[PDB]
Amino acid sequence: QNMLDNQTILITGGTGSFGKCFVRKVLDTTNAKKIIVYSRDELKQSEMAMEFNDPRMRFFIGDVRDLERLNYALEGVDICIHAAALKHVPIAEYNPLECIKTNIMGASNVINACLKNAISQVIALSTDKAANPINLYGATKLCSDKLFVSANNFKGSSQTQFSVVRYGNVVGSRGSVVPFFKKLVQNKASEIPITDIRMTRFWITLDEGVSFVLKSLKRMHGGEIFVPKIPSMKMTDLAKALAPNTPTKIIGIRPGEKLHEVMIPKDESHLALEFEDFFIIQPTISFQTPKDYTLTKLHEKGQKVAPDFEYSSHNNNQWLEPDDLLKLL
Amino acid sequence: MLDNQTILITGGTGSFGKCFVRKVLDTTNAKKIIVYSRDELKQSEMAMEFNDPRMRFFIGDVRDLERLNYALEGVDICIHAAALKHVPIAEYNPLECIKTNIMGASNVINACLKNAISQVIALSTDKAANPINLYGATKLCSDKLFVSANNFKGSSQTQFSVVRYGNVVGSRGSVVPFFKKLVQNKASEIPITDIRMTRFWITLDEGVSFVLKSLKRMHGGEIFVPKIPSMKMTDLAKALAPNTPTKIIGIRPGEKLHEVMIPKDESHLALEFEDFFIIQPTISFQTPKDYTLTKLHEKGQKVAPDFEYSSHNNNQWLEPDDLLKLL
Amino acid sequence: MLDNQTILITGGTGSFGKCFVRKVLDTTNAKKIIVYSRDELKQSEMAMEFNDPRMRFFIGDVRDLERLNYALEGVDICIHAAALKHVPIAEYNPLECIKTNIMGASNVINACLKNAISQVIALSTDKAANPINLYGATKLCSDKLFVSANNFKGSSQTQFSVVRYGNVVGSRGSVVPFFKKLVQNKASEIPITDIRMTRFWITLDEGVSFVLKSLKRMHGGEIFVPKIPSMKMTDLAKALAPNTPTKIIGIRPGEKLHEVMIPKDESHLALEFEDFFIIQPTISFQTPKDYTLTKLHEKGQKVAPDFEYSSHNNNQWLEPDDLLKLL
Amino acid sequence: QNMLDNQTILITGGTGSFGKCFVRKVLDTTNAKKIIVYSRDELKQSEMAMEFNDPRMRFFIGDVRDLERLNYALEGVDICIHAAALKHVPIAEYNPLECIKTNIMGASNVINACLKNAISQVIALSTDKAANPINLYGATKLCSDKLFVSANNFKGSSQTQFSVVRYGNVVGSRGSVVPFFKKLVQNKASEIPITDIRMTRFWITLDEGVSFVLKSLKRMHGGEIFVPKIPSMKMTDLAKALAPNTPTKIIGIRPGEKLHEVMIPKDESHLALEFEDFFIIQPTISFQTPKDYTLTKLHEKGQKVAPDFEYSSHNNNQWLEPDDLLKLL
Amino acid sequence: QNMLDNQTILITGGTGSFGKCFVRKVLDTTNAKKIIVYSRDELKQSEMAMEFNDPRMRFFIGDVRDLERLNYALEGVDICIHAAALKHVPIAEYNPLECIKTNIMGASNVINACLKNAISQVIALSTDKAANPINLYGATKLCSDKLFVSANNFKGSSQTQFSVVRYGNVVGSRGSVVPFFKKLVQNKASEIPITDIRMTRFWITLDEGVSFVLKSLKRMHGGEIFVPKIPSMKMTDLAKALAPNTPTKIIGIRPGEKLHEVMIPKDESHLALEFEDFFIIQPTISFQTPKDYTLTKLHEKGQKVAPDFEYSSHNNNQWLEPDDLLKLL
Amino acid sequence: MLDNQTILITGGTGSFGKCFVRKVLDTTNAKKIIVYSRDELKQSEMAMEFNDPRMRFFIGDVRDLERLNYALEGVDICIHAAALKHVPIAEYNPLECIKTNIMGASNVINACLKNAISQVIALSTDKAANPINLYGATKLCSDKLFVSANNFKGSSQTQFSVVRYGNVVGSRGSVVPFFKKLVQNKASEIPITDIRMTRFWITLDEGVSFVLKSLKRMHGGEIFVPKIPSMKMTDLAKALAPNTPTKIIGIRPGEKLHEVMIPKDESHLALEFEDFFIIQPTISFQTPKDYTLTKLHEKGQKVAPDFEYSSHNNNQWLEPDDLLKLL
């Protein structure tokens, strides 16, 4: 139990939506010795320091594009959770190199620093937009995922495990659509912005995502891309829920947007393993030191999937009606 | 036209490179053709086979911005073909592929803007459409950078476009030559990854010609996609070696069963022409562009809402016998 | 005037930034206003609140010279407001503050010279005068770099000036909003560092207006200091929360009891005008400048040999009630 | 006693005024195993190698702006004395970035290299021009001081202590005013250059500064800014001493110059601790591992100072007349 | 015997002429645990992986100009053979900075990475064009040689030995003249290109060079520049051998070419030591830890040479007639 | 002529530097002379000894490209004299010598091209001919870079030439001053490395004058070699100290017994003039050059097939007494 006692954890992008919730979770449910937040903004860090005001907290101002800073910050760290990223799809289309520097080079630097400091386990956050991506954001995350999975080939004086957690949209994420609509409805709610009527997405709550990352830590061998089984919801039903008696307005598909998202590509189903409530996409490459991904560290058994499996949000077997959504807010 | 123009091609010693250089020397009045690549061996050999005063060779890496800045001085047109393209090797050396393909694209763009290059065409691949392998992901990032670079507006406008096509019949390190080696080496079996494998096929000459036409058509920002045939890998092996049997070696790291050239999710951005497609930019530039009409006054039209250019459902299929005519 | 001019502001999403952008959009004919900062969240929100075609947003870091070189293309005026400004946090993250504030200044200067920007104004702080904290030391280095940059003489002359003023009432992450939060959160006590604490106070609108006038006055090389009121911190808390009592939390890392805007040791360099001061450069440029007469033909005069603009002995004091009118 | 036996010491800027005197002191009064000089100029190093010709000496050509070079040079070092710097006030005003690169980035690199090589103790030289600075030189030194003090927060496999020594003008320093006047008087001595008649400064001899650094090593805990109690002298009395019957000439205040210098800012008196013949300005920040700066490693007791203490050169309690100066030359 | 058992070896430029032969030699004649090829080209590495198809092989795509990549690749390595280089003399004259970056900075990076990873022994390949060089290629190799020899001064937690192997032209080297003529004779053989009639060179076979490097590993102390005793051949006799009845054509001396090559400069004879079939040019500098280069690790005794010794290819005591050459091909 | 020209000299505070600056100030109408070097001490002293408005001092390192890019703005002529030249120390600090001499050359070239400098002359040494020591190897690399840089063809053509000569009598840190120190220090013995030691000798004024003439003659690409006398080291010590005896300390790390200025293997590239030699480039530039005729219409002729300019077989020998006249 509690396989995280007296551990020092560092989370890049710790001031974000996932970050604050993750930090709260670790402080409340684990015996972790220290939690280090690594991010660039002094404003968000100053406010987070006040909000949490916990002696087990440490704040480092730093950029994941800065290898030297990461090298210094990861000293004495046991576990690294990599959540830092530029995630705005349309903005990434207009500022591709910035997204590339943060998401791709950021991954490379975090990996490098974790190896140098002999971190034990590392989990990087992916996204469904990284599966058969069409937008730059997703492309950078795919590169990131490939880097983290591949990093398990290294063999230093100390062993470091690198795994990835991939899930869909986070309900109420910082700068996401949910908060956007709630605000529009709060102001006047005259007409709700709708990209396309066919728009569908996977949905997971902040708590579910955070808990999934934590459990992934407990069962990972290193090299896995963990995918949780989650519900899908149509953007039209989402709007009516956040504003019952309010007219919608089609604004058109934004730059680099998909109508439906994928979490486990059809072309990679042969690498996928199913479990009670989650999947594991095995590495496409072979490590010098093989591993059995069918049995987690929690002794959970997994089975291969069908030769034509495709985990998409358009044909999901589970959904959420406007009433199920409200039960989250 | 390339009349009295100076053209530089990164990765000029490769399969596409040598064919492109030959075509430019023989069919245009380009004043100077610069080859930019790392290997002194290939450049020494290419200088011998292309002993032409119009040629100039620069040893250089696309990961080296200062070197590119120097080499692109006085250049009018830049063709970006340098890349790490072996899918399996990119899976094992992801950062190397990222440095060459992604940072290389960034450096070329930067050097082209600095030297006020007029037109730039970067080579893309169908592996960059809804990619699953690292190589394809790096090319998608490359494509996004080149398209985005059109937002720049310096003293001299620079146009950046992309050319995306499928597998090049018999390219350096590809399957075709590999199968020819086995056949000529008296192999008793032909290694087949998966019986369902399908691919688009374009000849080296077709690719080069398409790139040259793109130069004449481009406004900057387009991803040009040629209409080319597909071919089941089973048929290809059955043609290059009808006798010898085939063994199943299994799908290699990062491979797709079928390739996409125009994703369904990007249908709305596609414009169809008689012999090709243009995938319009997903972003809006400072100055609008009308991609429905090429610089050659060719008119294009939107495709069907459910359209997708895939190799598994292509209306054009390369005949196993007609393939031998290409070899 | 900013008539048909292109202006770029680093740290454009901050308190000064948004107020500056609004003022330029509403009171000038600037053709384009570029916001350059790192956060996609703030830029996405600012784009929504400033849905104006005159706006352009660039995601970028001032620690990134290549990014600045690109973003400043075609820019006429650059306002440098990007910085790490939290005094206590800079003490704990000194190198981070040094990278942003000092190297950031160096990169902006470099990019401005490369792109032949006409005028540049960098924001300074009174914490940079006879500094004791790391933040102030980095701003002093920044100020020195900007003043020194005027020695350059390229194809296009670039003027670099500095604007130095005190605490901005209610700036992002400052005390005022913090006290408002407590008051509206039903706090039973107001945290006071030291009963002797004194500070200069300027409103966001006053700061922005002063920067705009500096642009019209500057020859390049000046450090502009506005004549603004001082205010005992005790009075400020007594105004924002007359009821609730105040607790003494003690002086924070790197704090001064009173701030200086014009050091006594720099008196001889100061020139007084009706509404402001100019601290002349301590160095002599290749081409002399007469700071006694602004570009607006305003005449200034030397100050007293023992002069020093401090917040503890200011002849102007902000009335605790008059402060509420600013809030 | 002799807490420096069999130790390897590296001094950046070892060919300078402080450097040569410091090296001579260590070689003559300690059982140090080896002394490494780290500086850029081959001429000064070649001449110093001949002048000292001591087998315990090692010379490395290198720049403190060069992290890789520092990383290599500090290998196997136990103690690092950082004296390298651009110190010409007016020149720093004209070449601010150069002063910044050497003094600030130089400090960052030395710190980085000392941590990587597990150096035991490090002392960086500050200056009174770093207290409430007005000139760029002083500003860079203040940044340097802040970096060295802050570096004590790190906790690697090995512990490194970082302290700072701050004192006034060094009599006869390389390129300073004393040598300047002596030369003018040697040539013809027609008229002595005087910036301002009110000019006052703190004065310490090369030997006193060097000895102070050495003793600071013996009593430091890491994090301190050591300040020695030293005399003050008016520039007018200084001139008459270096040229009794010679007329002076007011040339005016040079770029970035103060009339009087400060060593312990009034605003930091609350951090200051007084001792028999020196002060300790405690860190403004709190380290994860607290320390008691009231009792040195030499068991010397210190007391807090008055709430309005201000160690300035204009109101010093001790001075030096033209006769006291001559007793130094 | 077999002083290389269970060792991990990394060879930069492993896909080249020397590289493939060296790898074949190690795999066939030693008990080495693993051999890592480090080079840039994916094509050559893909083909070499197929050609060798040995489980003891590992391939890393990487540039010696890339320190971070080298740092990563050399992890866990015991022996490093540095063969990567730009070696085309005329091309180096036209692309001097490229040759400098690869050969000089490449050497610096390899040295740096080997020290960081505590490699035991390192051998860099030199060339006779590095002795009293006139062309840029040779100048860069001379710099490289100086760097490797000098690197023996370092003293880390682990000791690393750095030696250099210098020999003449390799018969049939990739892109060399032999393959060139064979091709011309294969096509039509109308006229053979001849730079100058006086042209002479030292000649060693691929196998001899590779074996020499291996034996050098077994007898090196670190700091040596090993030179093998090899035959000399006139370019005219070389041509007649590769094409008996074919007319030659004088094309003139190419950029940066010598008529005759030197392997042991007259001015360094005082540092040279002779052995049965090889020489050792001792370091020009003195290491903190002296070494006796007169007795190898194989107990082979060496004697100083004459005060006017000059190992040139024009006055060699051994040569190869067109018949001796054919006995190599 | 240097009429109204701006000249920058790297390593301007050195022996060659100060002599060059004095000569330019006194014999030309150069409008501005910029000294670029690292040491504030030497620059402060040089500014005092050269208190002339035509002078300008930049603190900077040739290893710093950005600093060079800035300092060379508006410069017409660049003289590159910065270097690490102590042979023994370069052997012990090889990478340091490589960074300064080789990368320094690369940066100067890069900055000169960027700022469109008209002419550049880099100082070489006879130790760079058939070198055995690291120092000489770095200078050979430097020479190769400068010659090669002439292939560039930007908006403004930049000519790069090299000046190679022997030991400079009494240069900073050289033997002569060292022997003078001993003699004036009442030394009982003079350290001699080897009784066979021979060297070429040129005075500081001769070197400076030759550099100035090279500027007037150069087409770009030449390595200029002056005809100067040789001198046995035994004679030099016998002149500076006839009384005191000499001890044999042995050959120092990296020393040659005799120096070469023009290698036999480069004979075919040499052109002889009345007072000097030109070693033509080993490479062919985009645009040919006729080195047989200088810009001063001086005609040169090829040398003998077996020619080699060495110090051991020089037809000119410095008289031990005639040397004292130089001292």
Ligand SMILES: NC(=O)C1=CN([C@@H]2O[C@H](COP(=O)(O)OP(=O)(O)OC[C@H]3O[C@@H](n4cnc5c(N)ncnc54)[C@H](OP(=O)(O)O)[C@@H]3O)[C@@H](O)[C@H]2O)C=CC1
């Ligand atoms: N051949 C000869 O006559 C002699 C040569 N030598 C030396 O011996 C060594 C081997 O020579 P040889 O086998 O003939 O030459 P090759 O050109 O056949 O091999 C050179 C190898 O170096 C690799 N390489 C080149 N640049 C780099 C780089 N920047 N980073 C990593 N790898 C690089 C190349 O692989 P890739 O391009 O895929 O990176 C290639 O595998 C060289 O150092 C050469 O100087 C000395 C004496 C005799």
